[PDB]
Amino acid sequence: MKTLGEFIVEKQHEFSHATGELTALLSAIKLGAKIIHRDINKAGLFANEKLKAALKARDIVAGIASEEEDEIVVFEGCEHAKYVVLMDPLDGSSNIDVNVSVGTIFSIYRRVTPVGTPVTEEDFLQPGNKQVAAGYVVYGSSTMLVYTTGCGVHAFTYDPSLGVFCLCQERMRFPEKGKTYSINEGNYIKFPNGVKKYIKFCQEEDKSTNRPYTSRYIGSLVADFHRNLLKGGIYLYPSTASHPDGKLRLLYECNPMAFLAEQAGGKASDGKERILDIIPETLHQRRSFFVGNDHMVEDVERFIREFPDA
Amino acid sequence: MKTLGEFIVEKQHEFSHATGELTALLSAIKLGAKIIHRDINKAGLFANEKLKAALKARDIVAGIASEEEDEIVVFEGCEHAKYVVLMDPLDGSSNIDVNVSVGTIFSIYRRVTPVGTPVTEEDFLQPGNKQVAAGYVVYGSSTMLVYTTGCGVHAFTYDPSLGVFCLCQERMRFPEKGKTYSINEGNYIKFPNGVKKYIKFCQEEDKSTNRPYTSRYIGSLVADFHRNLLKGGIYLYPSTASHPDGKLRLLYECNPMAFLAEQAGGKASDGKERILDIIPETLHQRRSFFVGNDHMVEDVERFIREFPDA
Amino acid sequence: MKTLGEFIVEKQHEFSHATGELTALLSAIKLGAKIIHRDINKAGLFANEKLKAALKARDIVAGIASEEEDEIVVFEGCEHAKYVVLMDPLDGSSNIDVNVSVGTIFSIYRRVTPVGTPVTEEDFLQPGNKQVAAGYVVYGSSTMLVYTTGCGVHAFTYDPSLGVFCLCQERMRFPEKGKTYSINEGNYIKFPNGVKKYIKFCQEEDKSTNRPYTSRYIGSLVADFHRNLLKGGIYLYPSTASHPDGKLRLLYECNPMAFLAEQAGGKASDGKERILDIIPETLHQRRSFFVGNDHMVEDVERFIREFPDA
Amino acid sequence: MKTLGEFIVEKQHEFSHATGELTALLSAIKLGAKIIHRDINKAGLFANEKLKAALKARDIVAGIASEEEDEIVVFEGCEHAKYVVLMDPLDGSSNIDVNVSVGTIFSIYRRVTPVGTPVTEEDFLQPGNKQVAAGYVVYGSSTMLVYTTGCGVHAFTYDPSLGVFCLCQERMRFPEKGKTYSINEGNYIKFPNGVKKYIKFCQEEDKSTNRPYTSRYIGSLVADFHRNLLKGGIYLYPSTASHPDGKLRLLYECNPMAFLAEQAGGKASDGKERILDIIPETLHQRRSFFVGNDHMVEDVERFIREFPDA
Ligand SMILES: Nc1ncnc2c1ncn2[C@@H]1O[C@H](COP(=O)(O)O)[C@@H](O)[C@H]1O
Ligand SMILES: Nc1ncnc2c1ncn2[C@@H]1O[C@H](COP(=O)(O)O)[C@@H](O)[C@H]1O
Ligand SMILES: Nc1ncnc2c1ncn2[C@@H]1O[C@H](COP(=O)(O)O)[C@@H](O)[C@H]1O
Ligand SMILES: Nc1ncnc2c1ncn2[C@@H]1O[C@H](COP(=O)(O)O)[C@@H](O)[C@H]1O
Ligand SMILES: O=P(O)(O)OC[C@H]1O[C@](O)(COP(=O)(O)O)[C@@H](O)[C@@H]1O
Ligand SMILES: O=P(O)(O)OC[C@H]1O[C@](O)(COP(=O)(O)O)[C@@H](O)[C@@H]1O
Ligand SMILES: O=P(O)(O)OC[C@H]1O[C@](O)(COP(=O)(O)O)[C@@H](O)[C@@H]1O
Ligand SMILES: O=P(O)(O)OC[C@H]1O[C@](O)(COP(=O)(O)O)[C@@H](O)[C@@H]1O
Ligand SMILES: O=P(O)(O)OC[C@H]1O[C@@H](O)[C@H](O)[C@@H](O)[C@@H]1O
Ligand SMILES: O=P(O)(O)OC[C@H]1O[C@@H](O)[C@H](O)[C@@H](O)[C@@H]1O
Ligand SMILES: [Cl-]
Ligand SMILES: [Cl-]
Ligand SMILES: [Cl-]
Ligand SMILES: [Cl-]
Numbered sequence A, B, C, D: 001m002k003t004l005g006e007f008i009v010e011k012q013h014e015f016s017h018a019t020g021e022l023t024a025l026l027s028a029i030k031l032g033a034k035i036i037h038r039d040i041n042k043a044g045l046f047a048n049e050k051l052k053a054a055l056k057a058r059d060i061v062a063g064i065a066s067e068e069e070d071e072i073v074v075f076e077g078c079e080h081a082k083y084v085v086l087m088d089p090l091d092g093s094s095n096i097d098v099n100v101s102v103g104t105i106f107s108i109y110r111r112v113t114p115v116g117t118p119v120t121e122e123d124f125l126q127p128g129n130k131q132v133a134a135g136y137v138v139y140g141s142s143t144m145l146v147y148t149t150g151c152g153v154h155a156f157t158y159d160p161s162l163g164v165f166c167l168c169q170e171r172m173r174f175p176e177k178g179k180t181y182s183i184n185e186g187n188y189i190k191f192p193n194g195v196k197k198y199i200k201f202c203q204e205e206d207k208s209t210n211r212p213y214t215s216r217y218i219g220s221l222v223a224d225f226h227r228n229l230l231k232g233g234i235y236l237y238p239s240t241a242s243h244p245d246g247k248l249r250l251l252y253e254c255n256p257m258a259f260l261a262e263q264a265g266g267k268a269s270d271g272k273e274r275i276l277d278i279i280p281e282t283l284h285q286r287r288s289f290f291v292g293n294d295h296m297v298e299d300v301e302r303f304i305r306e307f308p309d310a
């Protein structure tokens, strides 16, 4: 049995010149996860500050950009830190009031501004391919923490009886094929033609290709992503009438999940280009997102190409 | 603060003739919920056997009919008992492997055969309107037990720090209106024409009626039902290519949930008639199911009328 | 597996004319125990009010006399209740600050004043032989609840994973012989001559009678009593320079523990007479106490008789 | 709030030459504490094997010497490790069966044999003054981990709701004076004359010096030591009829506790000389032990001088 704490240190030791700064940051994030886990499991019987405070009170990160807050947060006294964190403290917030799965998403980048000075939006506007690490914590029937630093997707399950995250899989990967699609069809009307065509494709009868597919949409990016990673599948959030540029935030949701998806052998695009290669323009920039099994994402890209929108 | 154990006893004393037999049954079911909660929260660091072995451990039921892995099992209990139980120990079982919400469903009936004799199938084939009690346990981000005996939908939240279920609401009810629909569109192709038309209706742009609706489908009857009860909405599982007569079992899923829905001010039908009044023919009978806010279920019934199937 | 909750009800059913009032009281006490357990297991990370409030808020007892409080507590609106409770919410209080075992003691009596009127000190000054029930909860490495109603000593172990007390032994009894004595020798100087002589006896070398005995003194009546009940032994608190009449309170500590000791096949006396037959004179009356294995208590009585004090 | 995991890392960085090897050892011991805490809190609803299997699971120690059920076992670890560990996985083991306080003791030494070779007994026979670290875990009403590496006695409380040890005090110290003595008077007969005289001293009536003292003896070295450190006091285990050279093992109990006692401003001797300076002769060596407030241990040494044994 190996704990997340032991695992992080073991990976650090593969880098003889590591100083322990990244290890300290990942360790602080897992502590934040335990705190959130505790509060969630006792609703009726915050998250944003919990992670910020937990991280700030530890002089471990130069700054943080939180999905809610319109502006970054510069940690005083941590100007000498080299990493910045972008986070979605509570993904699928809505589900909290109904006892359904929710999650936390995090993305880590090495700052571009000089260490010793205050971070700027420039440190938070780097393309996804610059991520040092990314991960999520899914709080459901049980809790799991999943992350990557570029050498695979490490999955851990929280053991309440011990109060620690235990290694589940050192290199989690999407299964060979997927047969589940996750999308909110309530916004069907203005879905791009390609997405409507893809959904049709998903509903056709064809045993040879595991069709018709089954649909699942929890309402939490993290939870749906997690299920698709474990059993195979695809998550889709295209442009809609309410969100012409897509709903998900490129920097707080798309980039982190795309990094994880790729490291698990999957794919993540906006329907036409690789999510991780998009050069961000603003902190709250939104983007269409299709992520999951490679063959499924490729199908979506095919239909979008073949059935353009006027 | 009031515990479920205390609540059950208080209710018993509202009946001068009560002997405590039903109380012992409701109490055993609550304990079973705790056992399942434990096993589930320990994914890796079933409910069916534990429940049966428990419900027999005290000879508190005349017999039990259960749905286990698409298989229906009947168990013989104490011939001197007057209540019979139908259950779904694990609803949405496949969700267990992905740390997603799952639940338990139970339904109680007073036997029709004379006490002191062995129970027959007739004791389990009564129409839903004869239920003495119905309820579910939802194991998600947190756990809740919801049940009814005819005087409202009582909702309780589990307090892990004390190991007790705490009263949340004595009479839970659907909000005035709903704006969420839950269905597996993967089986779209052979949905009845009315259901396809209803989905279209749900997607039209019309603010005055909260449209387009939002879509959510966790994959667990209990979890989706639970969410729609708390926030309003409708769950649908019509006839499909794979299940010509619907997928849900009339006895272990439809009747119990219908009892709860009506008690909460909602409606439950198979598309044309009231679920609770259907006279069952077999222990494995399946049925189309539409349940949730009344105006939503009425819409489905209407569209099915305006657009019949050949 | 049987829970304390199930057990209490099963015993109630042996009395066809029981109304459930005693069951409700015992049930409320166990809930109070869970509450105390929770707070104790998180020191740094009350008890009196917890039990009073928990019991009062349930209109379950006519009144309560707490070891601390100099006067009884009449529960308003519960004048119609027939039972009164004497308690030691936190026994061995001192040990709480040092992470050592502590406990809760309770004693139940049927009131003597008419139901419907306020209880008086007379209802709390009855001799121990009138107890309807008595028990304790020991909070240590793990927690256990132990009680009796006159038909043996029922022992339960708290299962944190389930949040319930599980039956350990339906009739716990002292082992055939004991070889542990528990006393605070710091107060040796004014110990009665018989007690000094008994201690000498305990220290003699004589394998045939398991001597010399081993000594153990946790500082918590409940914890020491509990260990002696499980492994055999005797607890002693005689008159001392600081407490000429003994330290323990006759009504809140001696009577409850004597009832339990006798029901477990042991003995409890003040050195000359049966504790349960002493007719109390005041609410905070103190008394010498020797309790545990019968042969050991008899030895103490023998030495006290044979070596009187001037 | 600071966790033990964070505290250990902070301490490591106070040493420019640190490589993280000792940190990995202290971290493994802390995890082992959590494992034992779990098993213990689950009495019925061992520490030795779990600890060894764990401390080997990562090849983090050159070797381990342990006391298990009065038996001494030696285990061979990674030849490339430079630290050796001596432990008492379960101290006061018999207390487990009675839900009483128990503990774990550990002692760490830098090996004397060259790294890269197999460890010898010489690596485990060093005098206490060569310890790199010492500490204990007390599992009682609640759990605490206390340790030292030479810069104070660091005390931590376990938070079950988060599964982490939280810093309570960086430099725990005995209060100015003590007024509690802990010893098993059951073995009185052959106590040395000085110890008998000291006990007399403890029982004299003299307010000016807080006498008579109070007596407490839980039966667990760790628990009694823990209490005396927090409230002041002295623990004594001299030579007895059953153990002519004392009962406590010099290596697994005396040295570790002596290290902690001195670091807290206390004293630890065998009655005549400093425990930490004794040169061990065997792995099973036992020794008389007097530890706690300095003035108390000095009194014992004095009485032993004024009243020698033939
Ligand atoms: N715990 C770790 N897991 C994975 N990679 C790590 C870890 N610690 C350090 N590294 C790698 O080494 C680099 C330098 O680490 P640091 O000195 O802590 O900033 C990081 O940017 C990573 O590329
Ligand atoms: N705990 C309870 N909650 C709700 N209704 C109850 C309860 N106990 C008894 N009843 C009602 O009283 C009837 C007779 O109770 P019993 O004698 O336990 O079968 C039941 O069929 C219910 O209608
Ligand atoms: N749960 C129980 N366990 C043991 N004896 C009980 C229980 N409930 C009732 N009794 C006995 O029946 C008497 C009347 O019960 P009650 O009507 O609840 O006051 C009590 O005083 C006891 O002698
Ligand atoms: N976590 C720590 N806590 C206390 N002292 C430490 C720690 N890590 C290293 N040291 C000290 O630094 C020395 C060398 O560390 P290491 O290279 O890990 O063996 C140890 O022998 C200790 O004296
Ligand atoms: O309600 P919709 O439009 O289906 O959007 C749901 C999506 O929005 C999100 O909730 C956005 O994240 P937040 O909950 O943090 O705002 C995703 O987790 C989820 O996939
Ligand atoms: O996978 P599908 O066809 O959408 O079916 C989902 C439905 O099937 C069920 O799982 C049937 O219950 P079981 O999990 O007990 O088989 C419902 O809980 C759920 O609503
Ligand atoms: O400190 P002393 O004199 O040994 O007395 C200890 C005794 O006093 C008591 O603590 C009295 O109970 P309280 O702790 O509730 O006052 C007993 O539990 C214990 O046996
Ligand atoms: O039963 P006795 O002779 O008083 O011995 C008690 C002492 O023995 C010990 O239990 C020895 O440790 P172990 O429990 O590991 O054998 C100490 O913890 C305790 O202080
Ligand atoms: O193809 P049509 O008739 O426009 O119907 C659109 C429907 O297409 C289906 O594929 C979608 O699952 C529905 O959500 C949608 O309403
Ligand atoms: O018998 P003496 O010499 O008066 O000694 C009294 C001693 O007698 C022993 O039996 C007690 O355990 C001691 O606590 C006490 O001090
Ligand atoms: Cl850690
Ligand atoms: Cl961890
Ligand atoms: Cl409950
Ligand atoms: Cl209960």
Ligand SMILES: [Cl-]
Binding pocket: C003, C004, C005, C006, C030, C163, C164, C165, C166
């Ligand atoms: Cl219980």
Ligand SMILES: [Cl-]
Binding pocket: D003, D004, D005, D030, D163, D164, D165, D166
């Ligand atoms: Cl920790």
Ligand SMILES: [Mg+2]
Binding pocket: A067, A068, A088, A089, A090, A091, A092, A093
């Ligand atoms: Mg969010």
Ligand SMILES: [Mg+2]
Binding pocket: A067, A088, A090, A091, A092, A221, A253
């Ligand atoms: Mg989000």
Ligand SMILES: [Mg+2]
Binding pocket: B067, B068, B069, B070, B088, B089, B090, B091, B092, B093
């Ligand atoms: Mg099922």
Ligand SMILES: [Mg+2]
Binding pocket: B088, B090, B091, B092, B221, B253
């Ligand atoms: Mg089901």
Ligand SMILES: [Mg+2]
Binding pocket: C067, C068, C088, C089, C090, C091, C092, C093
């Ligand atoms: Mg008290």
Ligand SMILES: [Mg+2]
Binding pocket: C067, C088, C090, C091, C092, C221, C253
């Ligand atoms: Mg007391």
Ligand SMILES: [Mg+2]
Binding pocket: D067, D068, D069, D070, D088, D089, D090, D091, D092, D093
């Ligand atoms: Mg031991």
Ligand SMILES: [Mg+2]
Binding pocket: D088, D090, D091, D092, D221, D253
């Ligand atoms: Mg020991």
